[PDB]
Design a protein around this ligand. Structure first.
Ligand SMILES: *[C@@H]1O[C@H](CO)[C@@H](O)[C@H](O)[C@H]1NC(C)=O
Lengths: 437, 49
């Protein structure tokens, strides 16, 4: 049987319902999401790390001109110096006094320690929500992993489940993300090839082992001044360490909606947001005939010491006049109160205690012991514990968040004002009819 | 649950209260005052004979 209903996406917090398929008995249905994996689609532009700036030996040649060539190496910088006369140890290196040519060559390379301390840059496109569902119907359980889009039921060995599109589309990732060492940051890195010096993305490559490495660090080769052979060069500071110095907090600690983000693959787990429209196809095997299911005649309610906390704060004694021994479900129709127990064992003329979690100051709700309806009506005290360590099982709806006596006084004032208005219009009508006569 | 309660400070005469949380059964708090020593701050100022 196709049953469609809106359920919370929050992890835990069981959602219970009943199906009424004519004369096939009220059949219970407990569903609860236990995992919520939000996996976006990522493409990789570049990986970056601290660079090394390997500088080869100078090419000095003595009484000649040695203009250099271009190269495909990362951030190749060449300069040619005249009028040099270098000293290595043990004496001079040119037989020429003043006519010499020194070649200074400086490209840049990944550090040997970039196998770990490397950050990849990604763009996420669309968040795909995959949720795992625990279902118990009657006495049959089912673990089903389903995508939340409206199609692809997936695992249908016994049960068919369609997860409709979610009410609110939430994505904890911004359009550009950076992953280093298992930590994700919502950073706006530059495009591939748009390398600026002193900031993130100064050196880029598609992969760590790729020879196609690009960089635009401000490396400048200086004119050699001292007698001894070397290269003088001034470089802009690597923007990778500057980004590490002021990365802010990673997205595992700043993500909204209370969910935690893991890498390989990049996903967000247990994101509690919105409501999932669910559509279940309950098999007819679990359905039983209403003649076999015991019926019920008279049901009375008495709930004592209600408290509208997040816990199951309330005990109701519930009296029945049973027709026949048997186990059969129980359910509270009002969304404001949810029952701990889903199926009781009703035999003959007993009192059943039930635990319910509510959010209204008034406990005025409809409950079905194994069929029919029952109006539980009493009052609920405020919680004494200010902060509880578990989430609320009922969301407020403002239809019952105002207390019964508060509706009484507020509606009494409204009724007084409206009654004065009605008396005013009535006496205007009477006076108009009198002056018309 | 923290239950504030006013008790007379007479020796003997057992005092009785009920503690209760809405999801729990009531329990019989039994409080008795046995001794009450009024020891003040005393300093010796002289001795005579
Ligand atoms: C960068 O590192 C230096 C070195 O100690 C530190 O003083 C500074 O607070 C860090 N952050 C910024 C934004 O300069």
């Amino acid at each position: 049987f196709e049953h469609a209903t809106t359920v919370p996406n929050v992890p835990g917090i069981p959602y219970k319902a009943l199906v009424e398929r004519a004369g096939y008995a009220p059949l219970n249905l407990e569903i609860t999401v236990v995992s919520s994996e939000l996996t976006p689609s990522t493409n990789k532009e570049y990986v970056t790390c601290k660079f090394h700036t390997v500088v080869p030996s100078p090419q000095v040649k003595c009484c000649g001109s040695l203009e250099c060539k271009a190269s495909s190496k990362a951030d190749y910088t060449c300069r040619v110096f005249g009028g040099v006369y270098p000293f290595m140890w043990g004496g001079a290196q040119c037989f020429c006094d003043s006519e010499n040519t020194q070649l200074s060559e400086a490209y840049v390379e990944f550090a040997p320690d970039c196998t770990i301390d490397h950050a990849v840059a990604l763009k996420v496109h669309t968040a795909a929500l995959k949720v795992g569902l625990r279902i118990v119907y009657g006495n049959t359980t089912a673990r089903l992993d389903t995508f939340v889009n409206g199609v692809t039921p997936g695992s249908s060995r016994d049960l068919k489940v369609i997860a409709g599109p979610i009410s609110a589309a939430f994505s904890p990732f911004d359009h550009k993300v950076v992953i280093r060492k298992g930590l994700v940051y919502n950073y706006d890195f530059p495009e591939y090839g748009a390398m600026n010096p002193g900031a993130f993305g100064d050196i880029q490559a598609s992969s760590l082992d790729a020879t196609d490495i690009v960089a635009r660090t401000d490396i400048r080769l200086l004119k050699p001044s001292v007698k001894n052979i070397h290269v003088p060069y001034t470089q802009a500071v690597s923007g990778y360490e500057m980004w590490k110095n002021n990365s802010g907090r990673p997205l595992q600690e700043t993500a909204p909606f209370g969910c935690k983000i893991e890498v390989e693959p990049l996903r967000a787990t247990n994101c509690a947001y919105g409501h999932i429209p669910i559509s279940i196809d309950i098999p007819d095997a679990a359905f039983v005939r209403s003649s076999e299911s015991p019926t019920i005649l008279e049901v009375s309610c008495t709930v004592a010491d209600c408290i509208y906390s997040a816990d199951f704060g309330g005990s109701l004694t519930l009296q029945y006049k049973a027709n026949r021994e048997g186990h059969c479900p129980v359910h509270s129709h009002s969304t404001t109160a949810v029952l701990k127990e889903a199926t009781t064992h009703v035999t003959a003329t007993g009192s059943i205690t039930l635990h319910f979690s509510t959010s209204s100051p008034q406990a005025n709700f409809i409950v079905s012991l194994c069929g029919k309806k029952t109006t539980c009506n009493a009052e609920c005290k405020p919680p004494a514990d200010h902060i509880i360590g578990e989430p609320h099982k009922v969301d407020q709806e403002f239809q019952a968040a105002v207390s019964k006596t508060s509706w009484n006084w507020l509606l009494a004032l409204f009724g007084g004002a409206s009654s004065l208005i009605v008396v005013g219009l009535i006496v205007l009508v009477c006076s108009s009819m009198l002056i018309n006569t």
